[PDB]
């Protein structure tokens, strides 16, 4: 009914780690780790490493950007960083071992895959969230048409919410669920970019993909 | 050269099996440093604090309906399952012991005091070693190292007999073990 | 009431060392453990891997949370440090020795904590390394640890070996001898 990042998810389990509030490393914390890779022979891999940490961050927030309406999104998000923390343990004591940094990079990749799997699993187990999410897409598509030739001056960030209030501001879900309403508001900024001719849109997010995919 | 204080956290999930997998008990425990703080006993069905420091955790975890259901079921989804996954090479693994007998002095100022029966490389640890002097079992003079686990899935043990052999006597070390249907024997002509 | 077998999943995390361990045990012997650095399952006996498997990723998840909990508890206990408990070292052979007949020395390090120790094999004063192996830190019902170090060797009439164990609970390094006695 709803597309999952991983079609037939493997059972995931929670460690009740959703209430942690400082799992994400600050720029200094990361820099301090990067400085351990001081030797010249490790300069090339260190680049690949930094790029991966960045990709990692982008992936985690990507998950919270599309599924902040799924109670379990915090579990997944936090687990991601708790694992990163452990990898850094090795990184910290093998800071100039190129093969080890290569492995760490490979692991961060697996951590991300695991995130996608578990994410898909928890979504598969929450029928109601699936229905609401699908609905958000349904309406955004309607809105894609409805706003066909209207002026969309979204410069002061006020028109988007107003449009959503006009068209659907009355729908139980738009009034009660901030994440849902936000999905639609996010939607018009996407619609606008679509009208202007942006073609990268589907790669923007699972939501964007679902909306502009046929 | 590192005087820094250390902090240790251990977690253990124990699956106790009785008569195959007929009766099963799961014991989950949290140990801070060298002291258990909280535990889940499948015989209880919910977390119980062992020390005061563990109360917050029992209270929090026990309020998690979905979690307790998982644990209560684990007896099947975890314990019974993993027992099966490995039965072949664990419950079933059998390795025949190698038996040898050689003399030794109880003191470097004594004659040729005791006979040592060396039983090594076997598995499981369950085993029996007896000493016979001309068909007559000997017991009052036996001393052993006790069972020894080598840490690589094999055991060993030395069973010694305190007896000064005299010409004509024939001692025998008999070893009974699950890997062999008929007792192993090694003789030693005095 | 007759207990036949025990399968234990044991894991731990230690500070400030930042070292963790995840492993499965059967009746006292290690079935397998997950090398944290490489993040991969390693079987105590290679045959085991040809009949079973384990998603190392799982270990990573568990240790990750373990690490978080250590932070929590240390703080909650008001930073109470673990009390060093020195090991009992014993060294014996795999089987009876015969000149030039391959054998193996086993150094048993037992009843200690924390799980940090430095071991060194010595043949006539020189540290030996080729061929030596060791187990990870094995659990004990009293929550202390067990560890085994192995040294394959060719018996001779002119060699004395000793296992040197260093631990925070010890005053000076402990040194166990072996010269066929």
């Amino acid at each position: 009914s709803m597309k999952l990042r991983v079609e037939n998810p493997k059972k995931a389990q929670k460690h009740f780690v959703q209430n942690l509030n400082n799992v994400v490393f600050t720029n200094k914390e990361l820099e301090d780790i990067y400085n351990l890779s001081n030797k010249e022979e490790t300069k090339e891999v260190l680049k690949l490493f930094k790029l991966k940490v960045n990709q990692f961050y982008r992936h985690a927030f990507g998950i919270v950007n599309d599924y902040n309406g799924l109670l379990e999104y915090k579990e997944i998000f936090n687990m991601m960083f708790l694992k990163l923390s452990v990898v850094f343990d090795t990184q910290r004591k093998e800071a100039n071992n190129v093969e080890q940094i290569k492995r760490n990079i490979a692991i961060l990749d697996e951590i991300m895959a695991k995130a996608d799997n578990d994410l898909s699993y928890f979504i598969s187990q929450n029928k109601n969230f699936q229905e609401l999410w699908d609905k958000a897409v349904k309406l955004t598509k309607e809105m894609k048409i409805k706003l066909k030739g209207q002026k969309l001056d979204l410069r002061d960030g006020e028109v988007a919410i107003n449009k959503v209030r006009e068209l659907f501001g009355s729908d139980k879900n738009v009034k009660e669920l901030w994440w849902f309403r936000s999905l639609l508001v996010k939607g018009v900024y996407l619609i606008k970019r679509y009208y202007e001719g942006d073609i990268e849109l589907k790669t923007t997010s699972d939501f964007a993909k679902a909306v502009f995919e046929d | 050269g590192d005087t820094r204080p250390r902090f240790l956290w251990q977690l253990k999930f124990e699956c106790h099996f009785f008569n195959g997998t007929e009766r099963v008990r799961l014991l989950e425990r949290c140990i801070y440093n060298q002291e258990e703080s909280v535990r889940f006993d499948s015989d209880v069905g919910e977390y119980r604090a062992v020390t005061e420091l563990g109360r917050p955790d029992a209270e929090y975890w026990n309020s998690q309906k979905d979690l307790l259901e998982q644990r209560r079921a684990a007896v099947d989804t975890y314990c019974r399952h993993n027992y099966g996954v490995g039965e072949s090479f664990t419950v079933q693994r059998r390795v025949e012991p190698k038996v040898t007998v050689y003399p030794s002095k109880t003191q470097p100022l004594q004659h040729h005091n005791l006979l040592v029966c060396s039983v090594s490389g076997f598995y499981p640890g369950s085993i029996e070693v007896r000493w016979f002097r001309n068909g007559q079992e000997e017991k009052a003079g036996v001393v052993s190292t006790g069972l020894i686990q080598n840490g690589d899935w094999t055991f060993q043990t030395l069973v010694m007999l305190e007896t000064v052999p005299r010409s004509g006597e024939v001692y025998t070390c008999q070893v009974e073990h699950p890997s062999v249907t008929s007792p192993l024997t090694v003789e030693w002509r005095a | 009431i007759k207990e036949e077998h025990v399968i234990i999943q044991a894991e731990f995390y230690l500070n400030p060392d930042q070292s963790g361990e995840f492993m499965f045990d059967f009746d006292g012997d290690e079935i397998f453990h997950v090398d944290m650095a490489k993040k991969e399952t390693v079987w105590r006996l290679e045959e085991f891997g040809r009949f079973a498997s384990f998603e190392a990723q799982g270990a990573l998840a568990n240790i990750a949370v373990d690490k978080a909990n250590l932070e929590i508890m240390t703080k909650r206990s008001n930073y109470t440090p673990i009390t060093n408990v020195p090991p009992e070292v014993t060294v014996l052979t795999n089987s009876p020795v015969e000149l030039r007949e391959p054998n193996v020395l086993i150094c048993f390090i037992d009843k200690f904590t924390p799980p940090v120790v430095n071991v060194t094999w010595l043949r006539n004063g020189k540290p030996v390394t080729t061929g030596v192996s060791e187990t990870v830190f094995l659990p004990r019902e009293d929550h202390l640890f067990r560890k085994f170090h192995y040294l394959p060797f060719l018996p001779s009439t002119e060699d004395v070996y000793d296992c040197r164990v260093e631990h925070w609970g010890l005053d000076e390094p402990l040194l166990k001898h072996w010269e066929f006695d």
């Binding site: 460690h15 209430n19 | 684990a74 975890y78 | 397998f32 799982g58 270990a59 998840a61």
Partner: peptide, 13 residues
């Protein structure tokens, strides 16, 4: 055959 494990839980608060 696959060895399944028990998930670790995050301590109170």
């Amino acid at each position: 055959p696959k060895y399944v494990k028990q998930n670790t839980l995050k301590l109170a608060t």
